[PDB]
Design a protein around this ligand. Structure first.
Ligand SMILES: Nc1ncnc2c1ncn2[C@@H]1O[C@H](CSCC[C@H](N)C(=O)O)[C@@H](O)[C@H]1O
Ligand SMILES: N[C@@H](Cc1[nH]cnc1[SeH])C(=O)O
Length: 245
């Protein structure tokens, strides 16, 4: 039932996280973490990467944080991230055209990520119901996650307790709201209420303030996902950075 446990998605996401770029758009997980690191003014002991997929943002965070925990619900994704952490490389297939496929390599050494791979730990888990043993963090990253969760409010309700005061929360999303992933009654934005628009960002503020303070302004970060030799997604996420009060 989970698309994120399929070979189709594995090949998209291993290319997206570790492959060459497309249309001269920079690697997206790396671009996201560059922005988080440019704004984090706290200590660098511990970061949490929620919805980490096959782990590029977690390895990027590990260049600066002593410990990085990456959590994703997809076991196929997490098994790839762990293999990269432990062996430094893996191979995968991408679609060329129809059934014609091509084998490719992901390599942490080539990306200058192998030296700190030991600072990562990857686990399967549900971001809407995180273990109560997880502790708290100096920095939390949730990339392209909130529009893929069935209970966004339940996810957000954990975050004040998960971030130390003075720490940083970074959420990015293109707000691709879909009933397949979020029941309409659980949307926190993307609709009209009492005849006025409620944007997803308004929903984020309602749930996070004043425990977090939004660093203004929000920023657009684009990304490209390769599906075949010829077909790509090209999308503009909104990044919002939040300081814990
Ligand atoms: N309940 C849940 N708990 C944890 N991860 C979840 C989840 N529902 C979906 N996900 C994960 O959220 C991700 C959405 S796509 C974004 C992946 C990655 N952060 C990137 O920016 O490229 C997928 O990896 C999916 O497996
Ligand atoms: N289309 C991709 C990228 C993404 N992630 C969250 N929203 C979007 Se659009 C996916 O569904 O994983």
């Amino acid at each position: 039932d989970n698309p994120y446990e399929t070979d189709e998605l594995l090949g998209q996401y291993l290319d997206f996280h570790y492959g060459p770029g497309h249309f001269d758009v920079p690697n997206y997980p790396k671009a996201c973490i560059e922005q988080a690191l440019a704004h984090h003014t706290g200590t660098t002991g511990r970061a949490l990467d929620l919805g980490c997929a096959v782990g590029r943002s977690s390895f990027e965070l590990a260049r600066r944080f002593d410990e990085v925990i990456g959590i994703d619900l997809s076991r196929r994704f997490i098994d790839s991230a762990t293999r990269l952490a432990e062996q430094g490389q893996l191979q995968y297939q991408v679609t060329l055209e129809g059934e014609l496929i091509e084998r490719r390599t992901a390599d942490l050494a080539a990306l200058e990520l192998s030296n700190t791979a030991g600072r990562t730990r990857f686990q399967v888990g549900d971001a809407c119901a995180l273990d109560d043993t997880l502790g708290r963090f100096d920095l939390i990253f949730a990339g392209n996650l909130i529009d893929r969760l069935p209970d966004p409010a339940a996810f957000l309700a954990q975050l004040p307790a998960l971030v130390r005061p003075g720490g940083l929360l970074m959420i990015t999303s293109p707000y691709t709201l879909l009933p397949e992933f979020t029941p309409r009654e659980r949307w926190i934005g993307g609709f009209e209420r009492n005849g006025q628009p409620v944007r997803m960002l308004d929903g984020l503020r309602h749930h996070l303030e004043p425990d977090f303070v939004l660093l203004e302004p929000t920023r657009d970060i684009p990304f490209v996902i390769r599906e075949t030799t010829r077909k790509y997604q090209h999308t503009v996420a909104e990044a919002s950075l939040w300081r814990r009060a």
